[PDB]
Each structure stands twice: as C-alpha cells, then as structure tokens.
C-alpha cells in the first residue's frame, strides 16, 4: 500500500511492458511522449532541447516504432522531425501505456520493426450516477510547473469525460553552470462523450486540441506552434454470438499544424548561413480507421480485422526581402501540398492455449501501401534554385506481408515463463525517408524514386521469473534488416546535405532486469539494456546506437510512505559511423561514460491526496548522452558539442483523487 516514485518498469508478460503514466517518475519527464519511455528499459531519447525528444528503441529510430493514441496514429509535419509524433502526446493524460517489443504484433498497424507503443484512455464505467476526478500539480527547478486534470460524470447509460493538462518549463542549466536554450510550454484538452444503452454496447465520440512552443538548443530553429486537433469515433459490441465476443470499429482524424522559425524564441544567427527572419509552416492531416472481430472457442482467441489510413502533408514558408527588409510571414501565402500516403491492410492473430503451460501465438498481415509525390518542383541544383521534379505526380505502391510466431512455455517446478518468437516485418518508407533527403541512392533521380522498403527478420526470446521474493525478466533479440534506410551527411556550399541509402544491417541486443524484496520494507532492483548494430554493406558499425546502460534502485517502505535512491551508469559507445545516422542525428564522436544519482520519496497523506518529491542528478554531474543533437553554434557551442543533460534538479508533486 506504500506509494512510490517509478524509476524503472519490468516486463509484465513476454515482450510486453505495461505501465500507468500518471504515477510519479524519477528522472522527471518533460511533458511529452518520449520521456515517459526513458523509464522503460531499452529506450533512449535524442535530446533536441528541453522537451520533444525523439524515442529510440533498441537503437531503432523513428517510424520503426508504432506510436498510437487510442489506436489512432498522430503524425508529425516537420521535414526535420521537430514535431515528432511524441511532441503531440502528453502521457499524463492517458491511463495506460503499453509497449510491445520487437515485430510481434499485427493488430495495431504496419511495419513495426522495433516495437509498438500504445497510450490509451480506458472507458469509464458507472454504477448509478457518480463522478470521479483526478488532478495533479508538479513544481520544480527552472520554472517547471505542470497542472493536469481528468474528470468524468455519468450513469448506467452514458458519461462525459474531460482531461486536460498544462505544462511549462524555462531553460534548464547543466552540471557545469551554463543555461541551455530549452524553454517550453504545452497544453491539451480532450473531451469524450460515451453512450452505453446496455452493458454489451459502447459508443464514444472524442474531440481534442493542443498547442505548444519549445526552444531547441540542438536545432537551428524553434517550435513556435504545435497545434493539434483530433476527432474520434469508437464503437464496440460484446457477446454478439457465443464464439464472436467483441466487435470494435473506430475512426480517427488527427490534424497537426506546426510553425518553426528563428525569431520568436531566438534571434537570428548573425554569422550563421541563415541570418534572415525565417519561418516555415507545415500541416499533416490524417484520417484512419480500424475494424476488428475477436472470436473465441475452445482454446483459441483469434482476432481478424482490416484497417486503412490516409495522410496529407502541406507546407509554406516565409519570404524575407533584403533591400526593403519587409518580412512577409508564411500564413500570407498559399498552401503547397506535396505528399499523400495511403495504407489499407488486413490482419489476423491466432492464440492457442494448448495445455495449462504452453501458449502459441501467430500473426500475419497484408498491407497495400502507396504514396504520391505532388511536389511540382524541388529546391535543388544550385543555391537551392527551383528545378522540375522528375517524380512530379508519380505514384509508388507495394504489397507487404508481415507476421510472427511466438512460443511461450511455463516450467513446472519454478514460476518461470520461457518464450521464443520469430517475426518478419516490412515497412514502406516514411515521409522523411522519401522527401526529406536532398539526394537518393548513388545515381538516382531523387529519393522518392529509388528508396526500397525495409524488411526486418528478427528472433526474440527471454524469460520471466515471478516468484515470492524475486521477480526477474529478460528479453533478447537477434535480427537482420535488409534495405535499412540510412542517412549520410556531406557539406558543400550551403549546409549539411543528407542522402538516403538502402543497406543491410545485422542487429542484436537485449534487456534484463530483476527486483528483490530483502525485508518486509527494503526493496532493491536492477535493470540492464544493450543494443548492437552493424552496417553489413560497408562493414561499418551502425550509427546512432545507444550505449550499454544499467540502473540500480533501492527502496525503504513503511505502509504510509517510501524513499528511494537510484544509480544510473552508462558506458561509453565506441561503435560509431561518422556523418551517418538518421534524418535527425549525425554520428560524430565516441561518447563518454558516466553515472548519475537521484533521490525520491512519496507520502500518502490521505485517501485522496498523495505527495512525492525528488532530486535528479544529486551530485550535479555535467554529462551528455551519445544520441543528443549538436548545439547550434549561434548558442555558443564548440566544434561538435552535444547538448548537455540537466544538472541538479528538484521536483515536488501532489496528486488529488476525489
């Protein structure tokens, strides 16, 4: 019954990590989707500024991760990923966060090489008329203030539920004393009304908006706007027949509208290679749907379904004159669409409960993806001068089958699950893998033409030991990527020119962790995370792989309250690939190891209020992580200074529940 601050999260079941993102988290997370994953072993984040970092699972970056918000998928708009999907997520507003590791699900959408991440709000249910309400405030160093509110009323046959949050923090300072350009401010409000005419039927309509700004020490422009608007429509039925137990259909609509610029949160760099006032606006309209049936008879849980999605990128940029010096903002100019993706697919996943102690799971899905290039012309060929785009209105498509099988066995003597699984996923290229790179494979025409789908074939295995005093778990993976999409960086005349290529990679790695109850109120727990990758085409290492990392926790509990400390130690990373990486990160230098210590405590003052506090980086260590971006230079950043992590940090949080 003793309340605690989360420092790490175990596998609850094979390949599956399920956590509730409203409980306090030790390295206190900026109010975005990424940082709520730092506690999950296996996840590193690329630091861009103070918030809105880009998650990386087992070294795999970007769209190899399937990030969903109530089954619907929010997509960014920026050509350099300043609005990564998790920019628009505030995990504190959802009731559950689930992670599935490796390519071991077909239910939630296509091409999930690395894993699947699910934030969901769960349906309210009401006896008679009643109302619940949760709220929490968090105050901390450097102007950190996060309010958050959920509230729902309803009765037997309906409900309406409001969730909202507002968070903001000022520039953090490192362990060395300097102020890091890393300001931010965010909010979200979502409403949901739901109808339940009888206990076997549910419909819910959802609407929400959100906005945010964020200063970026690593990127050459800041985020002036992260406007999001959503509309959702769920429908479920239970116990249709006696072998058809659930039918769910849902339609989502997510619109992102984002302005990056260099004069609202920063003044334009004088020397630079861009001293103009400059802004660029980008939107992404997304419409998608899912439709699934669960059948159960005998020892068989079969889920069949089809899905579809369409999304639409548009852009427009500022134009600044250099003799009248009258700047015309972008929103006084027409929208110039340039990409439309589509996806339709169908899927099934069968689960066989053969015997008490053995389970057999297998999924397949067939996807029909396609994109059309509406860029009538391109910024290439000179000072970036216009040049007729050879793929103008060209359309690419492909049919792509994924699938997996996984066997889980429970030993008879000990409380042990052993599991092994083989999965193969194919992924149609990203918006960013197709339109962002300034050139495509050697002797291509552009990137949109020649960039192949990436097909990943991975073996997953591990165990769970969940007995009385000891709980342990371990997952490993070995896999091969064929046609890994990979960016190389040159510089000539104007800036770091990207070039996307298609290479084969070998990847292995694992994660394990354990938690031991020494006494009735003393607890300890450690976790370990290693990722490894090799570029087989060039016999190079893979770029942008997080180094080996270990966490150790120790906890004292007393029913009413708890305290804990936390040692995080990370090794250097001596496998690099200079000037290669992804659309976010170049790899440059070998990283330095480090360790960071942290203190936390929690107190249950009553049934409704519950307090929590912590100190992050107690010994004010000045460190940087391998995957962080480089600092701007127009921010006083040396040759290739990565962006420093935050120094000593104090935070306190109160959690209400009437």
Tab-separated table of N, CA and C in Angstrom, residues 186-308:
chain	number	residue	atom	x	y	z
A	186	UNK	N	3.210	23.840	-22.965
A	186	UNK	CA	2.309	22.929	-23.667
A	186	UNK	C	0.952	22.874	-22.976
A	187	UNK	N	-0.098	22.602	-23.759
A	187	UNK	CA	-1.390	22.235	-23.187
A	187	UNK	C	-2.151	21.294	-24.116
A	188	UNK	N	-3.163	20.657	-23.533
A	188	UNK	CA	-4.051	19.727	-24.208
A	188	UNK	C	-5.357	19.716	-23.448
A	189	UNK	N	-6.453	19.728	-24.188
A	189	UNK	CA	-7.744	19.412	-23.631
A	189	UNK	C	-8.426	18.436	-24.562
A	190	UNK	N	-8.958	17.342	-24.017
A	190	UNK	CA	-9.776	16.406	-24.773
A	190	UNK	C	-11.081	16.157	-24.023
A	191	UNK	N	-12.184	16.090	-24.757
A	191	UNK	CA	-13.459	15.663	-24.201
A	191	UNK	C	-13.879	14.379	-24.893
A	192	UNK	N	-14.627	13.563	-24.160
A	192	UNK	CA	-15.201	12.339	-24.696
A	192	UNK	C	-16.575	12.164	-24.083
A	193	UNK	N	-17.582	12.017	-24.932
A	193	UNK	CA	-18.916	11.623	-24.507
A	193	UNK	C	-19.155	10.208	-25.002
A	194	UNK	N	-19.763	9.382	-24.158
A	194	UNK	CA	-19.959	7.991	-24.490
A	194	UNK	C	-21.340	7.508	-24.119
A	195	UNK	N	-21.914	6.676	-24.977
A	195	UNK	CA	-23.238	6.098	-24.809
A	195	UNK	C	-23.112	4.594	-24.592
A	196	UNK	N	-23.911	4.062	-23.671
A	196	UNK	CA	-23.954	2.626	-23.393
A	196	UNK	C	-25.390	2.198	-23.123
A	197	UNK	N	-26.168	1.929	-24.181
A	197	UNK	CA	-27.596	1.601	-23.988
A	197	UNK	C	-27.832	0.321	-23.205
A	198	UNK	N	-26.952	-0.668	-23.345
A	198	UNK	CA	-26.966	-1.845	-22.487
A	198	UNK	C	-25.523	-2.297	-22.315
A	199	UNK	N	-25.280	-3.152	-21.316
A	199	UNK	CA	-23.916	-3.431	-20.857
A	199	UNK	C	-23.043	-4.128	-21.903
A	200	UNK	N	-23.579	-4.334	-23.107
A	200	UNK	CA	-22.873	-5.031	-24.177
A	200	UNK	C	-22.612	-4.131	-25.383
A	201	UNK	N	-22.699	-2.810	-25.224
A	201	UNK	CA	-22.582	-1.897	-26.357
A	201	UNK	C	-22.040	-0.564	-25.863
A	202	UNK	N	-21.068	-0.010	-26.582
A	202	UNK	CA	-20.457	1.251	-26.191
A	202	UNK	C	-20.154	2.055	-27.442
A	203	UNK	N	-20.474	3.346	-27.407
A	203	UNK	CA	-20.069	4.284	-28.449
A	203	UNK	C	-19.487	5.504	-27.764
A	204	UNK	N	-18.411	6.049	-28.322
A	204	UNK	CA	-17.801	7.238	-27.749
A	204	UNK	C	-17.312	8.153	-28.865
A	205	UNK	N	-17.679	9.427	-28.770
A	205	UNK	CA	-17.151	10.461	-29.641
A	205	UNK	C	-16.105	11.249	-28.862
A	206	UNK	N	-14.989	11.583	-29.532
A	206	UNK	CA	-13.843	12.252	-28.914
A	206	UNK	C	-13.445	13.478	-29.730
A	207	UNK	N	-13.075	14.545	-29.029
A	207	UNK	CA	-12.517	15.731	-29.667
A	207	UNK	C	-11.458	16.312	-28.743
A	208	UNK	N	-10.440	16.925	-29.335
A	208	UNK	CA	-9.365	17.496	-28.548
A	208	UNK	C	-8.542	18.470	-29.347
A	209	UNK	N	-7.941	19.426	-28.643
A	209	UNK	CA	-6.943	20.309	-29.218
A	209	UNK	C	-5.732	20.382	-28.292
A	210	UNK	N	-4.620	20.864	-28.845
A	210	UNK	CA	-3.433	21.127	-28.057
A	210	UNK	C	-2.511	22.072	-28.785
A	211	UNK	N	-1.734	22.838	-28.019
A	211	UNK	CA	-0.705	23.691	-28.596
A	211	UNK	C	0.526	23.627	-27.711
A	212	UNK	N	1.656	24.041	-28.288
A	212	UNK	CA	2.930	24.019	-27.598
A	212	UNK	C	3.956	24.900	-28.287
A	213	UNK	N	4.879	25.429	-27.499
A	213	UNK	CA	6.088	26.032	-28.035
A	213	UNK	C	7.271	25.370	-27.347
A	214	UNK	N	8.434	25.435	-27.995
A	214	UNK	CA	9.623	24.788	-27.455
A	214	UNK	C	10.868	25.399	-28.084
A	215	UNK	N	11.810	25.811	-27.242
A	215	UNK	CA	13.116	26.253	-27.707
A	215	UNK	C	14.034	25.043	-27.867
A	216	UNK	N	14.853	25.061	-28.921
A	216	UNK	CA	15.704	23.928	-29.282
A	216	UNK	C	17.158	24.386	-29.333
A	217	UNK	N	17.973	23.882	-28.407
A	217	UNK	CA	19.396	24.185	-28.449
A	217	UNK	C	20.089	23.464	-29.598
A	218	UNK	N	19.570	22.299	-29.989
A	218	UNK	CA	20.196	21.453	-30.988
A	218	UNK	C	19.811	21.787	-32.414
A	219	UNK	N	18.597	22.269	-32.617
A	219	UNK	CA	18.122	22.565	-33.958
A	219	UNK	C	18.324	24.055	-34.255
A	220	UNK	N	18.429	24.388	-35.545
A	220	UNK	CA	18.659	25.770	-35.920
A	220	UNK	C	17.442	26.680	-35.941
A	221	UNK	N	16.258	26.159	-35.605
A	221	UNK	CA	15.026	26.930	-35.461
A	221	UNK	C	14.251	26.366	-34.276
A	222	UNK	N	13.301	27.150	-33.763
A	222	UNK	CA	12.496	26.738	-32.619
A	222	UNK	C	11.084	26.361	-33.067
A	223	UNK	N	10.345	25.713	-32.165
A	223	UNK	CA	8.941	25.436	-32.407
A	223	UNK	C	8.039	26.536	-31.880
A	224	UNK	N	7.452	27.324	-32.785
A	224	UNK	CA	6.534	28.393	-32.407
A	224	UNK	C	5.138	27.887	-32.137
A	225	UNK	N	4.793	26.728	-32.693
A	225	UNK	CA	3.427	26.228	-32.649
A	225	UNK	C	3.440	24.733	-32.914
A	226	UNK	N	2.726	23.988	-32.076
A	226	UNK	CA	2.454	22.564	-32.246
A	226	UNK	C	0.944	22.309	-32.159
A	227	UNK	N	0.160	23.061	-32.927
A	227	UNK	CA	-1.288	22.913	-32.858
A	227	UNK	C	-1.714	21.522	-33.341
A	228	UNK	N	-2.528	20.849	-32.530
A	228	UNK	CA	-3.110	19.556	-32.850
A	228	UNK	C	-4.623	19.629	-32.670
A	229	UNK	N	-5.382	19.060	-33.620
A	229	UNK	CA	-6.822	18.860	-33.446
A	229	UNK	C	-7.196	17.429	-33.794
A	230	UNK	N	-7.998	16.805	-32.932
A	230	UNK	CA	-8.384	15.416	-33.087
A	230	UNK	C	-9.894	15.249	-32.996
A	231	UNK	N	-10.376	14.220	-33.696
A	231	UNK	CA	-11.756	13.753	-33.679
A	231	UNK	C	-11.750	12.237	-33.763
A	232	UNK	N	-12.506	11.585	-32.882
A	232	UNK	CA	-12.516	10.143	-32.820
A	232	UNK	C	-13.927	9.606	-32.694
A	233	UNK	N	-14.083	8.338	-33.062
A	233	UNK	CA	-15.408	7.726	-33.036
A	233	UNK	C	-15.225	6.221	-32.829
A	234	UNK	N	-15.424	5.760	-31.597
A	234	UNK	CA	-15.295	4.347	-31.272
A	234	UNK	C	-16.673	3.699	-31.195
A	235	UNK	N	-16.710	2.398	-31.463
A	235	UNK	CA	-17.919	1.598	-31.324
A	235	UNK	C	-17.525	0.155	-31.019
A	236	UNK	N	-18.053	-0.404	-29.922
A	236	UNK	CA	-17.755	-1.777	-29.522
A	236	UNK	C	-19.070	-2.513	-29.276
A	237	UNK	N	-19.082	-3.822	-29.573
A	237	UNK	CA	-20.140	-4.709	-29.105
A	237	UNK	C	-19.532	-5.974	-28.511
A	238	UNK	N	-20.076	-6.411	-27.373
A	238	UNK	CA	-19.667	-7.621	-26.674
A	238	UNK	C	-20.729	-8.708	-26.827
A	239	UNK	N	-20.289	-9.959	-26.714
A	239	UNK	CA	-21.137	-11.159	-26.789
A	239	UNK	C	-22.201	-11.072	-27.893
A	240	UNK	N	-21.726	-10.974	-29.141
A	240	UNK	CA	-22.603	-10.993	-30.313
A	240	UNK	C	-23.220	-12.383	-30.447
A	241	UNK	N	-22.407	-13.369	-30.841
A	241	UNK	CA	-22.776	-14.776	-30.718
A	241	UNK	C	-22.144	-15.331	-29.444
A	242	UNK	N	-21.826	-16.626	-29.408
A	242	UNK	CA	-21.089	-17.201	-28.286
A	242	UNK	C	-19.656	-17.561	-28.659
A	243	UNK	N	-19.324	-17.520	-29.951
A	243	UNK	CA	-17.949	-17.593	-30.431
A	243	UNK	C	-17.466	-16.275	-31.026
A	244	UNK	N	-18.337	-15.278	-31.173
A	244	UNK	CA	-17.935	-13.918	-31.513
A	244	UNK	C	-18.184	-13.065	-30.273
A	245	UNK	N	-17.107	-12.611	-29.625
A	245	UNK	CA	-17.228	-11.975	-28.321
A	245	UNK	C	-17.043	-10.466	-28.333
A	246	UNK	N	-16.469	-9.895	-29.390
A	246	UNK	CA	-16.233	-8.459	-29.414
A	246	UNK	C	-16.101	-8.017	-30.861
A	247	UNK	N	-16.720	-6.891	-31.192
A	247	UNK	CA	-16.503	-6.227	-32.471
A	247	UNK	C	-16.249	-4.764	-32.184
A	248	UNK	N	-15.110	-4.261	-32.632
A	248	UNK	CA	-14.724	-2.881	-32.400
A	248	UNK	C	-14.459	-2.235	-33.747
A	249	UNK	N	-14.963	-1.024	-33.922
A	249	UNK	CA	-14.635	-0.228	-35.093
A	249	UNK	C	-14.388	1.192	-34.638
A	250	UNK	N	-13.446	1.850	-35.285
A	250	UNK	CA	-13.111	3.175	-34.826
A	250	UNK	C	-12.567	3.971	-35.991
A	251	UNK	N	-12.859	5.262	-35.963
A	251	UNK	CA	-12.418	6.185	-36.991
A	251	UNK	C	-11.749	7.357	-36.298
A	252	UNK	N	-10.568	7.712	-36.761
A	252	UNK	CA	-9.852	8.795	-36.140
A	252	UNK	C	-9.511	9.865	-37.162
A	253	UNK	N	-9.230	11.045	-36.647
A	253	UNK	CA	-8.867	12.154	-37.502
A	253	UNK	C	-7.943	13.063	-36.702
A	254	UNK	N	-6.697	13.195	-37.140
A	254	UNK	CA	-5.694	13.949	-36.403
A	254	UNK	C	-5.072	14.966	-37.340
A	255	UNK	N	-5.107	16.224	-36.948
A	255	UNK	CA	-4.510	17.279	-37.744
A	255	UNK	C	-3.449	17.983	-36.910
A	256	UNK	N	-2.219	18.009	-37.424
A	256	UNK	CA	-1.091	18.718	-36.830
A	256	UNK	C	-0.748	19.932	-37.679
A	257	UNK	N	-0.499	21.056	-37.023
A	257	UNK	CA	-0.172	22.291	-37.721
A	257	UNK	C	0.929	22.983	-36.927
A	258	UNK	N	2.091	23.169	-37.558
A	258	UNK	CA	3.330	23.430	-36.837
A	258	UNK	C	4.145	24.506	-37.537
A	259	UNK	N	4.593	25.505	-36.772
A	259	UNK	CA	5.461	26.572	-37.272
A	259	UNK	C	6.816	26.498	-36.585
A	260	UNK	N	7.867	26.292	-37.366
A	260	UNK	CA	9.230	26.506	-36.907
A	260	UNK	C	9.739	27.833	-37.458
A	261	UNK	N	10.529	28.545	-36.652
A	261	UNK	CA	11.073	29.842	-37.050
A	261	UNK	C	12.336	30.118	-36.246
A	262	UNK	N	12.925	31.298	-36.494
A	262	UNK	CA	14.206	31.660	-35.905
A	262	UNK	C	14.193	33.088	-35.363
A	263	UNK	N	13.026	33.591	-34.970
A	263	UNK	CA	12.950	34.959	-34.471
A	263	UNK	C	11.876	35.155	-33.417
A	264	UNK	N	11.151	34.110	-33.016
A	264	UNK	CA	10.168	34.240	-31.950
A	264	UNK	C	10.676	33.707	-30.623
A	265	UNK	N	11.557	32.715	-30.646
A	265	UNK	CA	12.197	32.248	-29.424
A	265	UNK	C	13.708	32.401	-29.471
A	266	UNK	N	14.235	33.135	-30.444
A	266	UNK	CA	15.676	33.286	-30.598
A	266	UNK	C	15.920	34.401	-31.594
A	267	UNK	N	17.042	35.037	-31.483
A	267	UNK	CA	17.261	35.995	-32.556
A	267	UNK	C	18.100	35.340	-33.642
A	268	UNK	N	17.909	35.735	-34.902
A	268	UNK	CA	18.586	35.023	-35.994
A	268	UNK	C	20.096	35.123	-35.854
A	269	UNK	N	20.779	34.029	-36.174
A	269	UNK	CA	22.228	33.977	-36.005
A	269	UNK	C	22.888	34.950	-36.980
A	270	UNK	N	23.708	35.911	-36.502
A	270	UNK	CA	24.312	36.891	-37.417
A	270	UNK	C	25.262	36.274	-38.434
A	271	UNK	N	26.328	35.598	-37.982
A	271	UNK	CA	27.258	34.931	-38.895
A	271	UNK	C	26.533	33.836	-39.668
A	272	UNK	N	26.236	32.712	-39.015
A	272	UNK	CA	25.239	31.758	-39.499
A	272	UNK	C	25.446	31.321	-40.948
A	273	UNK	N	24.372	30.804	-41.562
A	273	UNK	CA	24.192	30.786	-43.006
A	273	UNK	C	22.710	30.905	-43.296
A	274	UNK	N	22.055	31.802	-42.562
A	274	UNK	CA	20.620	31.999	-42.449
A	274	UNK	C	20.322	33.124	-41.454
A	275	UNK	N	20.852	34.340	-41.650
A	275	UNK	CA	20.602	35.425	-40.685
A	275	UNK	C	19.293	36.174	-40.899
A	276	UNK	N	18.513	35.787	-41.913
A	276	UNK	CA	17.190	36.343	-42.139
A	276	UNK	C	16.248	35.983	-40.988
A	277	UNK	N	15.192	36.765	-40.791
A	277	UNK	CA	13.997	36.206	-40.158
A	277	UNK	C	13.359	35.209	-41.112
A	278	UNK	N	13.106	34.009	-40.603
A	278	UNK	CA	12.674	32.910	-41.447
A	278	UNK	C	11.733	32.021	-40.651
A	279	UNK	N	10.591	31.687	-41.246
A	279	UNK	CA	9.626	30.791	-40.630
A	279	UNK	C	9.083	29.858	-41.697
A	280	UNK	N	8.684	28.662	-41.279
A	280	UNK	CA	8.113	27.691	-42.198
A	280	UNK	C	6.992	26.951	-41.500
A	281	UNK	N	5.851	26.873	-42.165
A	281	UNK	CA	4.664	26.248	-41.613
A	281	UNK	C	4.415	24.934	-42.333
A	282	UNK	N	3.870	23.963	-41.606
A	282	UNK	CA	3.662	22.615	-42.137
A	282	UNK	C	2.489	21.978	-41.416
A	283	UNK	N	1.583	21.368	-42.167
A	283	UNK	CA	0.470	20.663	-41.557
A	283	UNK	C	0.423	19.227	-42.041
A	284	UNK	N	-0.259	18.389	-41.272
A	284	UNK	CA	-0.408	16.986	-41.635
A	284	UNK	C	-1.804	16.555	-41.230
A	285	UNK	N	-2.619	16.243	-42.217
A	285	UNK	CA	-3.970	15.767	-41.986
A	285	UNK	C	-3.931	14.251	-42.046
A	286	UNK	N	-4.564	13.597	-41.080
A	286	UNK	CA	-4.554	12.142	-41.009
A	286	UNK	C	-5.972	11.649	-40.788
A	287	UNK	N	-6.399	10.711	-41.616
A	287	UNK	CA	-7.684	10.066	-41.427
A	287	UNK	C	-7.475	8.571	-41.529
A	288	UNK	N	-7.974	7.832	-40.530
A	288	UNK	CA	-7.728	6.406	-40.441
A	288	UNK	C	-8.891	5.697	-39.788
A	289	UNK	N	-8.873	4.369	-39.890
A	289	UNK	CA	-9.965	3.563	-39.375
A	289	UNK	C	-9.502	2.149	-39.124
A	290	UNK	N	-10.195	1.475	-38.220
A	290	UNK	CA	-9.845	0.115	-37.849
A	290	UNK	C	-11.156	-0.622	-37.608
A	291	UNK	N	-11.143	-1.944	-37.769
A	291	UNK	CA	-12.388	-2.715	-37.728
A	291	UNK	C	-12.017	-4.164	-37.470
A	292	UNK	N	-12.380	-4.678	-36.305
A	292	UNK	CA	-11.820	-5.934	-35.847
A	292	UNK	C	-12.874	-6.744	-35.118
A	293	UNK	N	-12.678	-8.060	-35.130
A	293	UNK	CA	-13.577	-9.019	-34.506
A	293	UNK	C	-12.742	-10.000	-33.717
A	294	UNK	N	-13.147	-10.278	-32.496
A	294	UNK	CA	-12.498	-11.333	-31.743
A	294	UNK	C	-13.427	-12.533	-31.685
A	295	UNK	N	-12.891	-13.690	-32.028
A	295	UNK	CA	-13.585	-14.949	-31.876
A	295	UNK	C	-12.871	-15.775	-30.817
A	296	UNK	N	-13.637	-16.457	-29.977
A	296	UNK	CA	-13.044	-17.385	-29.026
A	296	UNK	C	-13.939	-18.599	-28.903
A	297	UNK	N	-13.355	-19.748	-29.190
A	297	UNK	CA	-13.956	-21.043	-28.967
A	297	UNK	C	-12.821	-21.967	-28.574
A	298	UNK	N	-13.130	-22.996	-27.796
A	298	UNK	CA	-12.079	-23.962	-27.450
A	298	UNK	C	-10.952	-23.196	-26.745
A	299	UNK	N	-9.701	-23.536	-27.036
A	299	UNK	CA	-8.546	-22.739	-26.630
A	299	UNK	C	-8.009	-21.943	-27.821
A	300	UNK	N	-8.842	-21.052	-28.355
A	300	UNK	CA	-8.440	-20.237	-29.495
A	300	UNK	C	-9.019	-18.835	-29.354
A	301	UNK	N	-8.145	-17.838	-29.416
A	301	UNK	CA	-8.505	-16.425	-29.363
A	301	UNK	C	-7.969	-15.866	-30.669
A	302	UNK	N	-8.846	-15.740	-31.648
A	302	UNK	CA	-8.470	-15.265	-32.965
A	302	UNK	C	-9.024	-13.866	-33.197
A	303	UNK	N	-8.158	-12.949	-33.609
A	303	UNK	CA	-8.553	-11.577	-33.889
A	303	UNK	C	-8.284	-11.306	-35.355
A	304	UNK	N	-9.342	-10.958	-36.099
A	304	UNK	CA	-9.274	-10.652	-37.522
A	304	UNK	C	-9.754	-9.230	-37.740
A	305	UNK	N	-9.187	-8.563	-38.728
A	305	UNK	CA	-9.516	-7.171	-38.906
A	305	UNK	C	-8.858	-6.612	-40.141
A	306	UNK	N	-9.406	-5.489	-40.586
A	306	UNK	CA	-8.854	-4.706	-41.677
A	306	UNK	C	-8.664	-3.278	-41.182
A	307	UNK	N	-7.740	-2.550	-41.807
A	307	UNK	CA	-7.538	-1.159	-41.428
A	307	UNK	C	-7.186	-0.332	-42.659
A	308	UNK	N	-7.158	0.987	-42.469
A	308	UNK	CA	-6.826	1.901	-43.552
A	308	UNK	C	-6.443	3.261	-42.980
